[model samples]
Target: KKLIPILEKIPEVELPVKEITFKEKLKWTGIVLVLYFIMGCIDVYTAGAQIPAIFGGTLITLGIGPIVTAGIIMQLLVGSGIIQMDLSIPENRALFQGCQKLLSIIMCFVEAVLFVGAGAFGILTPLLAFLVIIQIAFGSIILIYLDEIVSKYGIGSGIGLFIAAGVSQTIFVGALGPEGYLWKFLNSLIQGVPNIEYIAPIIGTIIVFLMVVYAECMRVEIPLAHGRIKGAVGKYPIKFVYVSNIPVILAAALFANIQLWGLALYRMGIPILGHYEGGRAVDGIAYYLSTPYGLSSVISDPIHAIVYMIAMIITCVMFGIFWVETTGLDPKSMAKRIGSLGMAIKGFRKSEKAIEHRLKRYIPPLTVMSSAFVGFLATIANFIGALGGGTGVLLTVSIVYRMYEQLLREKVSELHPAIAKL
Candidate 1:
């Protein structure tokens, strides 16, 4: 694994660890949360925003979409042997990250251009294109810094918080805001006009929320000896969801792009890819790839549902496993980290190999299984019409839980400022 010398030249942020406080972490997280929601509310063209029918193009339309997609692209390149950097080497790891960031910015530029070209804000004249591109590009870069800050100095992730912010805003607007789904349903029911369609999605959202919570909590805690304290023992909690909901997020973003491609092709009368009923796909590759979700839609299209489920499950698992390996969450890396930290599994002599063996027993299978479970959960949730899509809902709940866990730990530490690790 050779280090990318180019990456070594870039200066990086180093958080003031000794001087930083839990309060500061909370402050940064709060700042990101606030920024996310506010930016989300302010659309690029409030009046002329011409979002594609199959895509979500908000004022915060970019929403780290480019960053995530860049990660996927890089992962694919590495996985396929097109890129040879090994992540285990520090220099190589740095290179991967630097490259990902560079590609992410490029993706942002490409997406912005296409979005404007797609007439998301009316005809993309030179001036309008420049205005829209600049806004979205800056928005994307801001998202990059947000994620990095959270990872370095705040709670959870900037991406996770942004996702939670987006989903929360969407659900709130749909369920309780002025003329929202819940409000409309309430009014409609009073006058015997409650639409049956909204019922399943709302109900589904609640069910998925509970399901994500339950799934996240289910874990296997492996006992380990503290390297610093000889006899001190603690449990490393590995949740059943293994890699969390990230794979699902990646999966959703990938599928959304696939749908967009299909739509674009359909507009060119590509019948094999999809046959559109208006803007929506009815049958063909597009419909199979993008199943029509809802009570009636699912019931009416069993083949599509089955095909979609299989594909979704496969795709999610693939991404999940891929991410786990590349993101240094794989058993080998975890063992390496644990070993380097002077920690070891309880029953074995404190060695990296010993810890790695134990991790292998759980991590490999868990990665695939947990991913499949989430993939299935996402499909089921969406089938029932969970709003903002099921994967997004799943991610929102998981991110909130992580943020809450971090907050509680920080809050506890705040109460005792003496505990030190809080």
Candidate 2:
């Protein structure tokens, strides 16, 4: 999983990171952002607003969802040893990428077809539907490549950029934009009724954003030094949330799928999971699994709240560990990075195994802990009705914070050219 040395071992190889530059990064990031927004606004086949809301309402609805899901699946398969391929070899890794990309395209095609058939778009001529499906298929593949480009050559993620843009809108519109609920309530409080129900979410959103910003900064830096260069010290920092906000999004999506599956299976004249009557779960295990948001739901069914929280925490942690391993954030990968960088832990053995052993002391526990925080915090953030989705709100905060760090790092290097050497 640690590919850098293998990369160095074959210096002739063209690594993706070599393709990026400061200007190119910004340009590509902007391009992907624009493209994501465009795709999000562009519609394919007409569908019910309800289903779209559940997953990518606009052309952008599919957004990076399918690709990420594909990644998750591929990682699981590879890690479980179900798919036998030695990732240490460059050829194998390329093969993996090719496979994931193909799966992404397939998912896009399948989802588009499903959307067309879901009866949400109202009746459409066969010709019209075919055209719409083609449009959707093209748009999704574009988004997938854009996502890959962003991560490989630009900044963090194309999906993260888009999600942050969305959360930014909610924050602005919910609080200060013209006719925003919070804005209206702020002014309304001067005269009479303050709409707490509508405005509470904006408040919660702010709190969550602020909290993540501060927490992300609170990192544990492992002091590092060059083997040949004395007095040249650096740090390899491990974030409190080592795995990032990815686990949260995947966690939430997992539940949403299960919930939908329960609803669908019940709707198909089977109550094996639970009987959903009038668009609500009325009986069985499905009802237990399908929990509600907000204070009223908690008051009405505390059992639902308990079950939901436990499930959320467990799923987030499970997904978090899986994501880290699948994505190559594991100890071996990190150790490989340390070894490849020609750096070593200060006052310790200078070897890949040493570095990996050191990382093991922290990564797994942090994975579980960070995942718990994400799940529990998201639970509170959702029940409190934060603007934008709960996991998404956290994602926005983390993404924006990372971007700020990125910009700041670049700025510091620009201002101090000598610092780049150290």
Candidate 3:
């Protein structure tokens, strides 16, 4: 095949296929399992603790576990078709979707209003507390629904927007401190050096442009040749190869889930074995994971924690591969579809084995590149967040600005005719 020649000509970069060493991988897997068990234990603890707080009037009515649990159960049941209602009509579906969006916007406004009111009222009244709880729950539900809609119809997804927003908040906070990076640049002007804060914005702006340009332009092209059909000559097709960034996103999500669960358990007073309570326990896992000590600890102290992160990374990689495979990208399946449509490569025979072999050869590099990108991105993001204190801000500003630019471009394109006439 033509691809074989092209592939041969390209030099292969030596890269580690596995995430970690064999011994570390084994230890980390064990530690992860233990952490999962601890997570389940904490869930039990929270369930028990919540009951006492609920009955003792120490918790708000909205905070009662059973009530929220029931709501979640009902939502799942309805969602899973155990208690399905008729939504077969187009009008009804549209109405439902519209109501969902309206409710989300209203809930966001109400939550904001109530939060402000709560500060102004300065009261710890049960009714006020209950209102706050309801606001949070409703706001969360609306956002979840909105996220689904955005993922289905809009750019990227709502969760992406939400994450970006959080990043923006961190960035804003980072710019505020007197000794912060932003202020340090500003202070330079007072010391006779020109203020660089103006340049900071320019640099950020350039980064945004570069990210968009790179994301859009970075692609690999695959050549294809179609075989002659019945009595007609066949033609060639070109396939562009681009790295799907989903694996990295999924990996980040996996780590975030683990980190959040660990923090949640720690907050709920669930003791993780061999770790002290409070900051030490929280810091232990976080600190250990980021450093050589954390890697060593998995080999020596509690091997499970390291296992946990690796298992998660492996799971994410598998999921990414499975997604790509099942989504019509599998070489064998694609070849079948192409054959059914009366297509074949001109240089190659119309055989499934050949097509699959070609696809298999290309897929490995894609998977390796994607996996490395995801793992490295997740690790680097965590490190930056830990040290720079603006990971959230960085994500938020990047996303928001990206979205704004996209919207602006869309609107400008729409008005192009009017401008042209003028």
Candidate 4:
């Protein structure tokens, strides 16, 4: 009880007083995107840091890392039955949201310290390190609020849009920037030399993009008949990648934390985790956990590749199942909803237990299928050195497609306001 009240004390973005129009939603989304890009360019006051993709090291060096980690922590607690609050209640859900926000703010500071103290800023002096930590934490806090504003007033969730924007920028640069492989090939051609060496990664990215789009189209449809109506029927579609890019993001977040901790521990003269050389995990647990880049890396360090592959698959599957359970996508929840809506599978009885038993056939397998497929695809894409990164390409494509769907839905609701109730 005290914890809930304390969580409520955290300042939050105000929800819009009136319904947001489509154009207004677009405007807000654009504004947030612009702000994100601006901060991406505003370098942190550090000497230098090799920020990861979707993270610019300027202000948002964390790049939604803290928020995502907060989500993972909160969901795991709830999913594992460690926190027994009934999330179906609106108040409880709100309380959960507040707790996640509080944890995010805490992680903002925690990750800033982890990165800064791990020589991310090239071993800053004590005073400068503290200042940089504050700056990084402040930047992530801004992103947290921006995410809230976007969820309530903009087109799509701010976090996904931000990620898509970052990946799109990287892809564009990879294709057309001066030092990009495509540009390199063109430059080579201008010099009358045949150099297609830079074309491989571009090809890999295209392949990954198409593969995800295809996977999105694959789904298993469960037929349902209205209990009250003789002829009314519908099909509930469970996507092949039912969990989407959630598992990938969670797994990537875990990997990031592992690397951060590994580096920090090594720096603290506790090499129990691993030793990092030049920010790369060269030996120990960190080395096996480090992701391999491209063909040469896989060939030269096959064991690292194997370990990463196993880790990616296992983690993705684990997170995928937990997400489904926590987010009410499990068979039991779906059965209850179906029964309440007066829909029943033709072969099954009207009972929720029967419906759940029927659903059990597909949901669990699909969960593993979706999670494993994306994880394996990401591994291969990274091995090929896909432009914009393997994980980045998967996330960006999925987010963009989802946003397109949201835009269509919004346009439809705008035209026929009554349809919005569904």
Candidate 5:
């Protein structure tokens, strides 16, 4: 009761009251995107945390961590009935969104404290630590607001938009930076002694990009027809990568937190989680959780590499299942939604249970397999030292593809005729 008023006080991005054209959406998205990039380049004078797809030592160093972690937690709570909010109602939906934003703000504070206390930016005096925490929290809070704006007025999602931007920057740097493999390979070729070592990352990047695109293209469609209608029909698609980016991002964030806490514990003379030496996790649970940087590390520590792969796959699968269940994408809720539309699977009874039964056969298995595939692909990219980091490239490709879909849909809606070829 009291919470709603407080949550409302947090302020929100005003929704567009008028019909916003595709060009208007593009303008908003582009403005937000440029701001995100500028933030990424603005260094924090205090410190930085080296989270994947996040630029360290920058205003956007926290990236979408707080927002994403908050979303995951809120979805789980609401899905599990712990939150007790029916999202179908407009009032409930607004309240739900408000709570999510509140949680994100809280997360920004917690993560900032953890990062500073963990000495991720090095040992700091009380004053310096306080300053760092403020900087990090404010940076993330700004991102949270920007995300709201993008959600209401821009294209795609602010989270995906920022991630794709960061990943693109990483890819560009890894391709031609002085320390990058591609640059070395180019120089070597010019000198007439090409190094085979540099070729692997370039090849690996191409492979992951193509594989993700292929995965996106693959899906299973369930034919649907109205129970009383004469001839109208439609297909409900279940994509191969059904969960998409959610599982991977959550799994990655979890591992990063483990590493952070492990370092903090080790510094306090408790190496139960893990200890680091020479700026790397050398032993304990953290060592196994750490990602392999290149082919050499994978070869040198095969056990670590294997364990990481297994862990990543398992984590992604678990998160994927959780995501589906909590987000109402599970069989029961999906069947309910479908049934409410007065539609049923073509070969099944026009009943909820029957539709759910059919869905059960496909949803669970697809969740596991697709999630595992994503985990495996990401791990391999890390092993191969893919240009932009395997996970980054994977995320970027998917985000970009989604944005493309959004653009095409808008174009079709705006134009009188659908152009077969663009």
Candidate 6:
């Protein structure tokens, strides 16, 4: 009721729905998918073959994992603004993107050369390997930026697409079995004589699609009241999902840390105190918890995987809350923004304490719900993977489908005559 007057004062604007022909849409999708495919090939080739050469000094299984983990950690810290950059202007965002792409190209070339050189030179010397490692690290950062460009300008998320391609490659190479026990059992139980080989891929594809939909659509809304000041006498929106992707990225970063720590212990030949098995060590309290005698192991076998999954969920939730708090969604920031704009909720007094209390009360449930949603999706993905498929297919399909749907909706919205006129 309060919003009517305010809305009426503003000129009516028609929404645009830009309707591209089906053929055009198809063409665009194809181009984007092809680009995604190429990027995936490059990424896989570099990671599988070139990366080890670049870090030849630390090429042991355990050492490689830790090095990769360190690289990922560095990238996440830089990208998340945890390590602040001086460029604050909006224009710098685009420049950053460009630099990322240029760097990725250079790095890929360098890594490929290093790999070839290592083989020819009978393994790169330690000094040369160290230099190669530095190049690889820098190159990896550029690759991430290149990926960001693909996500921003292309049809699908660059990383998701790359992952999908890698998963596909794995399947091709028989790393993923077509006639696994799970598939055979399902085939036997079903009425139809399903081909075990084909069933796994189909199920994997479906699960992936579902996860993406779940991730993109899941949200919790927080109702905000506006004050009675000029131009602020009604409802205003501040979305909880505004920072959605960050939680997933943060969760992954956390998982990468675990992987890195484990690798470090492995490389150092240190037996994780209290959880040593066959000369191999698992690190930290979490690893112990996942060990056979650990408390959590009673509920699941391969306790480490379960622990990792739980950690992913917890991290996602924690990061979501952290993001909101740090980004000024707290009571103090909201109050300041509202007060400056001359807005207030109808029943609540315009006091800082009241505002802070209200916001704090509002945030907890939303944070929990968002985190739970992400966690639930992760759990489902893991379940499917356990049935003989990997999470890559699920994550990739989910992200690509959502991106396509979003772009389609935007295109339609832009084409509406009223929208175009506005």
Stretches > 4 Å off in candidate 3: 1-133, 151-156, 165-184, 191-218, 226-244, 273-287, 290-316, 322-347, 351-357, 360-365, 381-422
Q: Candidate 4 lDDT, tens digit per residue, 239-338? A: 5653647777887778777787888888866898887887658888888887665322358777778889898899888788777656636575677778
* Cα RMSD, each candidate: 4.1, 6.0, 18.7, 3.0, 4.5, 12.0
lDDT of 6 by residue, 9-123 (tens): 4332232345544455446545655654454334321222433321122111111122233333434444467764433454444344334344344444444343334242333
Candidate 1, lDDT over the whole model: 0.70
lDDT of each: 0.70, 0.65, 0.41, 0.76, 0.73, 0.46
* Superposed model 6: Cα runs more than 4 Å off: 1-36, 39-139, 155-157, 160-245, 269-310, 328-361, 383-398, 412-422
Supply candidate 6's per-residue lDDT for 13.
22
**What does candidate 5's lDDT look like per residue over 184-286, in tens digits?**
8888999899897776677777776777677767777778886577675878676566355767877766777677678767775678887787655789889
TM-score of every model? Answer: 0.83, 0.77, 0.45, 0.89, 0.83, 0.51
Residue 194 C-alpha lDDT in model 6: 61
Worst 10 residues of 1 by lDDT: 53-62
Highest TM-score: give the candidate number. 4
Model 3 CA lDDT for position 267 = 47
Q: Give the Å error, residue 143, model 3.
A: 1.6
Give every collision pair in model 1.
43-59, 50-120
Which should have the higher TM-score, number 2 or number 5? 5
Model 2 over residues 313-376: C-alpha lDDT tens digits? 9878877776655554656666766776668777576777876787778677777888888688
- Number of backbone-clashing residue pairs for each candidate, in the order shown: 2, 4, 22, 1, 0, 18
Give candidate 2 regions above 4 Å deviation: 1-21, 43-64, 116-119, 122-132, 174-179, 183-192, 221-236, 264-297, 330-333, 336-352, 409-422
Q: What value does the lDDT take at residue 397 in candidate 2?
A: 77
